[PDB]
Amino acid sequence: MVQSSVLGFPRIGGQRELKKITEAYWSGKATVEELLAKGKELREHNWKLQQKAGVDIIPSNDFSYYDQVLDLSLLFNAIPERYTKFDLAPIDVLFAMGRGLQAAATTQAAVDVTALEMVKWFDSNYHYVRPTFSHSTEFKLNTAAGIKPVDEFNEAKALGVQTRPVILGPVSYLYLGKADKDSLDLEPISLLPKILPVYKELLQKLKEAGAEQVQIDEPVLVLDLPEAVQSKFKEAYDALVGADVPELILTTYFGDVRPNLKAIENLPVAGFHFDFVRVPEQLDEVASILKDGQTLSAGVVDGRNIWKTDFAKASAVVQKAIEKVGKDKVVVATSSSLLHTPVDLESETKLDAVIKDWFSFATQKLDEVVVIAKNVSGEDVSKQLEANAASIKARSESSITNDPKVQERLTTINEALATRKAAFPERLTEQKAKYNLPLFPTTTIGSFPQTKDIRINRNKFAKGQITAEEYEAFINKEIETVVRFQEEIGLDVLVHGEPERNDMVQYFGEQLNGFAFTTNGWVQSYGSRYVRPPIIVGDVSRPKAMTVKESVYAQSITSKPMKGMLTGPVTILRWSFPRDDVSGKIQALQLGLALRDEVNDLEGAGITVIQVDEPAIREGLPLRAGKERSDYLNWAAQSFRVATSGVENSTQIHSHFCYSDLDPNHIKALDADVVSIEFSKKDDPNYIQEFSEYPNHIGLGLFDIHSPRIPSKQEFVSRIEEILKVYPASKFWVNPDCGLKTRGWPEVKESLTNMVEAAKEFRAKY
Ligand SMILES: Nc1nc2c(c(=O)[nH]1)N[C@@H](CNc1ccc(C(=O)N[C@@H](CCC(=O)N[C@@H](CCC(=O)N[C@@H](CCC(=O)O)C(=O)O)C(=O)O)C(=O)O)cc1)CN2
Ligand SMILES: N[C@@H](CCS)C(=O)O
Ligand SMILES: [Zn+2]
C-alpha cells in the first residue's frame, strides 16, 4: 500500500487570511496575540485538509509569517547585531529583518534599521530573505521566540495529526546565505562546523517530541556545485544522523542532481526525494545510489505549475521506481512544496469550464497524489483514471490552443527584427537633443501606491457596480494626482503610477489572446505580497491596444517627458504559469512579436519614451551551465529585442531588473538605453564592480522601496558619492530600487523629495 507525501502547503489562506492579519499587526490594528492566534487557525485548517484528503506524509514548519528561511535565520540566531540593540520581541526582530523598521520615540522606544536582502528562490518568483552571516555570529538555538518547528509539530499532534517537519539543511542554508559587509572575507559554507551542532540539537528536540521522519531540504544539489562543496554533504549528514534523531529524508527539487551523485552516494540518511516532473530521466541513475534501508520519494505532481496531472504518465514513473527499488520503499510525492501554487481551484467561478477542467491548484493536487498512490497500490480507482484521462484528451484536442496566423509570423523573426536602427552612442546624441535632460536625471520605476480606493474601484468596475465611463474618470483623477505630485517634487522623467493595473503581468494576461487568468488564484511572492499569475494555454497575440488610452492621457497633462510601461516578453512568461505542450523559447518569441505591436502603437500615439520591464531575465536562467542555458541567454534577449527594435532612435527604451543575482553581461545584450537596477535593499558588495563596464545608461537603485523607512537626504548622497567613485556622471540616472505600489503616500512623498533634493546637489557641484 504505497504511501503519499506532500512537501509543503501554501500558508496564505483561501481568503488571504494571513495577509490581512499580518498587515493589521504591522499597522497596529491587531495584537501580537491575534496574529499568533490566526497563524494557529490556518495551520490547523491545512493539516486537517490534507488529512482528510488521504495524504499520509504531512508537512509541518512549512508555515511562515514571512519566510521559512528567515525563520531558520531566527532559530539559529543568525541575526545581525544591528537588529538586537532595541529590545524588540522575537516576532518583531523577525519582521524588521524583513522590511526594516522606523518609529520615533513614543513608552514605545525609538528604532531605525534597514531590511535585509531578498532574492529569487532559484528560478521562481518566490523570494527569500538571504541569511547574512558575520565573524561575530554565534550560532545558538534560540528559544526566546519559542522553537517553531517543535511547537508546530506539537500543535498538529494535539489534533491527532502526525507530521513531517521540514527544514532547510545546513549546506543549502549556508550556501544560499551571504557574508555581511563587516566580514567580506567570509565564505558562508565555512561555518558548517559551527552550525551543525545546532541542527543536531534541533533534531533531538524533534525526536523527543515524536518526530519519526524529517524532510530536510538540500535543493542546492540541482545546481553546479564546486567540488569542495560536494564533499561537505557527507561531513554534514554523518554529523547529524543517529539514534537520537529522526530519520532524515534528503529532499531535492526544481532540477537535476546527477552531476552531484558522488556527493551523496554514501550518506547515512533514511531516504531521498527527487523531482521527476522536471527531470524524470534521472530516475535510473539516482535510484542506483540507494543502499538498502533507504526510500525514494518520487516527485511526480508538479509543485510549480497548475496543469492537471496525467495519471497515466505519472503512475508509469512511480512504477518504473517500484521496478528498481521495491513497492515498499517508494513514495508518491509532490515534485516540490505547493508553496508556488494557489490554494483551491474550486474558488474560481469565471473560467470556461472547458479550460478549468485542465487545471489543479493545491487542494486538487492533494487528491492527485492520493489517487496515484492508490493506483500503484493495486486499489481500484478506475473511475478517476478515466475522468482524468478525459480531461487530458480534451486538453490535447482543442481549437482554442492554436493560431496559425501567429505560428507563421514567427518566421519573420531575424537579426534585423532584433537590432535597432543605430548603436546606443548614436541614439544618445539624438535623445539628449530631443529631451534636453539634465545631468543626474531623476525618475522612478512606474507604479505608485495601490490605495484601497484604487483597489475598491477596480473591483466595483469588474463587478459592474460602475460604468467604464465612471472608471476612466476615476483613473484619470489618479493619474492627474500622480503627475501633479511628480511635478511638484521636481521629477524629470515621469511615470503614471499604474493605477489601472492590478499587476504588471496580470493586466497583460487579461488582454492577450492565448491566456487565462484567475479571480482568487493567489500565490505568495514575498512577505504579505502575493500575485495571481496568469496562465498560458495557447498561441499568443495582441488584438487591441493595451496601454495607450492611459499613457496618452498621462502625457497630455504634463509637458514633462513620460514613460510608457510594458512588461517584456521574458517576464510575462516567467511570472505566468507556462504551457504544458511547448517550450518557453517559443512562448517568449510570441510575446516579443506580440509586444512589438504595443510598443509601436505607443510610439505612434505620441509616447516616445517607453519602459519595458524585464525583471525575470536572471530568474528564468536555467539552473545549470550547458546547452540549455546558453540557448536561454540568446533567445531571452532576442525576444526582448524583438519588442523594442522597431523604435526610432529619438525614442528612449528603458528597462528594469530587481531582486535577483543579476548578470550584467546578459542585461547588456538587451542594448536598452537606460535601466534601473535594484541595489539598496540587496546590500550587494560587488554590483558596483560587476557593472563597471556597462556601456549604456544606468540607474543603480538608491533606496529600499519595500520598507516604510524614509531615508535621509543624507543616505542618498552617500550612495551616490560611492557610485560616482567607479562610474562617470554622464551615464548615471537616479531612481529607487523598484516600484511604489506597496508603499504608502506619506513616505513616498518625503523619500522622493529627498532623492530629488539630493540629485539636485550633485547637479550643481558638477
Ligand atoms: N508578479 C509580480 N512579480 C514581481 C513584482 C511585481 O510587481 N509583480 N515585483 C517584485 C516583487 N513582487 C511583488 C508581488 C506582489 C506585489 C503586490 O503589490 N501585490 C499586492 C496586490 C496586487 C494585485 O494583484 N492587486 C489587485 C488586488 C485587489 C484586491 O485585493 N481586491 C479585493 C477586493 C477589493 C478590496 O477589498 O480591496 C479582493 O480581491 O479581495 C488589484 O489592484 O486589483 C498584494 O497582494 O498586496 C508587489 C510586488 C518581483 N516580482
Ligand atoms: N514597473 C513595476 C516594476 C516592479 S519590478 C512597478 O513599478 O511596480
Ligand atoms: Zn522591480
From Swiss-Prot:
Keywords: Amino-acid biosynthesis, Metal-binding, Methionine biosynthesis, Methyltransferase, Transferase, Zinc. L-homocysteine binds at I445, G446, S447, E498, D613. It catalyses: 5-methyltetrahydropteroyltri-L-glutamate + L-homocysteine = tetrahydropteroyltri-L-glutamate + L-methionine. The active site is at H706. 5-methyltetrahydropteroyltri-L-glutamate binds at K19, N125, D503, Y526, R529, Y530, W575. Zn(2+) binds at H656, C658, E678, C738. Inhibited weakly by methotrexate. Pathway: Amino-acid biosynthesis; L-methionine biosynthesis via de novo pathway; L-methionine from L-homocysteine (MetE route): step 1/1. Its EC number is 2.1.1.14. Changing M118A: 22% of the catalytic activity of the wild-type. Binds 1 zinc ion per subunit. Catalyzes the transfer of a methyl group from 5-methyltetrahydrofolate to homocysteine resulting in methionine formation. This is 5-methyltetrahydropteroyltriglutamate--homocysteine methyltransferase. It comes from Candida albicans (strain SC5314 / ATCC MYA-2876). The gene is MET6.
